[PDB]
Amino acid sequence: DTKEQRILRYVQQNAKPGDPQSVLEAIDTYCTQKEWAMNVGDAKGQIMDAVIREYSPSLVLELGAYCGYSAVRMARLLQPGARLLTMEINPDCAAITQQMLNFAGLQDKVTILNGASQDLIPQLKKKYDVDTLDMVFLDHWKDRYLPDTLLLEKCGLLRKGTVLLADNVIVPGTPDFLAYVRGSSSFECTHYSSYLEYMKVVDGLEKAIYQGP
Ligand SMILES: Nc1ncnc2c1ncn2[C@@H]1O[C@H](CSCC[C@H](N)C(=O)O)[C@@H](O)[C@H]1O
Numbered sequence: 001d002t003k004e005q006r007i008l009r010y011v012q013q014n015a016k017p018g019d020p021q022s023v024l025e026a027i028d029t030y031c032t033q034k035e036w037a038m039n040v041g042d043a044k045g046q047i048m049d050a051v052i053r054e055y056s057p058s059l060v061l062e063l064g065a066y067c068g069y070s071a072v073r074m075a076r077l078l079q080p081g082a083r084l085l086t087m088e089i090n091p092d093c094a095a096i097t098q099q100m101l102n103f104a105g106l107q108d109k110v111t112i113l114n115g116a117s118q119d120l121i122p123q124l125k126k127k128y129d130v131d132t133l134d135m136v137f138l139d140h141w142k143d144r145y146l147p148d149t150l151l152l153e154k155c156g157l158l159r160k161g162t163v164l165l166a167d168n169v170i171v172p173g174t175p176d177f178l179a180y181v182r183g184s185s186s187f188e189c190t191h192y193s194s195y196l197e198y199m200k201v202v203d204g205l206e207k208a209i210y211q212g213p
């Protein structure tokens with residue numbers, strides 16, 4: 001089996017079905033005590049929680065699902081009727097994410113879209129009936145953050161006040177993305193210094209609020 005399979009099995013055997021907090025705790029314990037994995041983690045997760053609570057987004061787009069940790073973490077705080085779409089290029093990851101969401105009882109709030117973000121983003125309006133996004137969580141691959149941000153703008157998917165939240169702007173680091181949003185009068189940016197998941201290594205999240213074209 002794979003590490004991702006081991007994480008999922010650990011949750012199924014150590015968390016309570018239908019209880020998202022217990023799922024997060026089981027994942028964080030596994031990744032602390034057994035095998036590191038690239039979930040946003042509890043330290044940066046607490047900052048995401050605060051952002052989600054502040055904005056109460058009706059429609060969130062996540063880029064990069066992995067095992068479903070951030071999807072569980074965000075979806076558990078959404079209001080009734082509010083929705084998450086998560087895009088995931090790796091089908092084995094998409095499979096784990098679906099089972100993780102099912103176990104957590106959050107499957108009615110979240111839709112996994114299978115494919116590369118750069119291929120799916122242009123389909124959101126016509127195929128997935130999206131008008132504009134309230135929030136986007138960027139957590140896929142560092143080199144995609146800037147191009148996908150510009151693609152989301154091109155496609156008309158951002159509105160005034162759309163919240164972009166980006167993980168790993170320090171490690172692995174997204175220097176082109178940070179230079180761009182921080183120099184652009186189309187964004188209002190805030191940096192949230194924290195730590196890499198499960199490690200005493202400095203990392204951070206960037207919040208960039210779109211201000212219109
Ligand atoms: N272009 C792209 N489109 C969609 N997913 C991508 C991608 N490039 C990488 N990925 C995926 O992005 C994921 C990064 S890890 C995601 C962690 C997750 N947000 C969490 O915190 O729990 C991986 O599963 C990888 O397959």
Ligand SMILES: Cc1nc(C)c(-c2cc(O)c3nc[nH]c(=O)c3c2)s1
Nearest residue numbers: 038039040064139140141168171172
């Ligand atoms: C020292 C590190 N090694 C890896 C492998 C890290 C790491 C940490 C993350 O949160 C990530 N989130 C999304 N996508 C990634 O590629 C990713 C990578 S940090």
Ligand SMILES: [Cl-]
Nearest residue numbers: 041042043198
């Ligand atoms: Cl952590």
Ligand SMILES: [Mg+2]
Nearest residue numbers: 040139167168
């Ligand atoms: Mg990350």
